[PDB]
Design a protein around this ligand. Structure first.
Ligand SMILES: CC(=O)N[C@@H]1[C@@H](O)[C@H](O[C@@H]2O[C@H](CO)[C@@H](O)[C@H](O)[C@H]2NC(C)=O)[C@@H](CO)O[C@@H]1O
Ligand SMILES: [Cl-]
Ligand SMILES: [Cl-]
Ligand SMILES: [Cl-]
Ligand SMILES: [Cl-]
Ligand SMILES: [Cl-]
Ligand code: NA
Ligand code: NA
Length: 129
């Protein structure tokens, strides 16, 4: 599924991401935009052979099992394919774990490079929330 910006914002809000660990909703929407272009089916391969999955490009090195990232962890205790669902619950629940792990949203490269320190509230501008 390719989410609309505000559709995703609302979904993320309903799932408790707004100000989760101090990260206002626009951070999450920004992150999703630049990680996946709001596409739940996005996958990308990393240089180490892990793969990033879903709307928040959660990687298989640490967070999910895709059966092809030897030596990896599955800290979200999910198949990576669950992160490709049109239902973002698995991604959100995993993202909550990631962002809670001490490094905040810096885990999301695109967030660090494209959202952090910007006016992320713009990403939820005009949305009914
Ligand atoms: C939370 C999450 O999974 N974020 C992804 C990053 O992990 C990806 O970065 C890449 O992650 C792999 C696995 O840890 C690293 O080996 C790799 O070096 C790292 N790549 C960079 C440029 O840091 C990122 C890839 O675009 O995608 C999500 O942000
Ligand atoms: Cl957009
Ligand atoms: Cl915001
Ligand atoms: Cl694996
Ligand atoms: Cl959803
Ligand atoms: Cl933080
Ligand atoms: Na990425
Ligand atoms: Na894994």
């Amino acid at each position: 599924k390719v989410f609309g910006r505000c559709e995703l914002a609302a979904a993320m809000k309903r799932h408790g991401l707004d100000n989760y660990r101090g990260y206002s909703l626009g951070n999450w929407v920004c992150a999703a935009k630049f990680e996946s272009n709001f596409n739940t089916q996005a996958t990308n391969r990393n240089t180490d052979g892990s793969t990033d999955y879903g709307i928040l490009q959660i990687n298989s090195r640490w967070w999910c099992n895709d059966g092809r990232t030897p030596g990896s962890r599955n800290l979200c205790n999910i198949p990576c394919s669950a992160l490709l669902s049109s239902d973002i619950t698995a991604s959100v629940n995993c993202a909550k774990k990631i962002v809670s792990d001490g490094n905040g949203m810096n885990a999301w490269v695109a967030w660090r490079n494209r959202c952090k320190g910007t006016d992320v509230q713009a990403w939820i501008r005009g949305c009914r929330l």
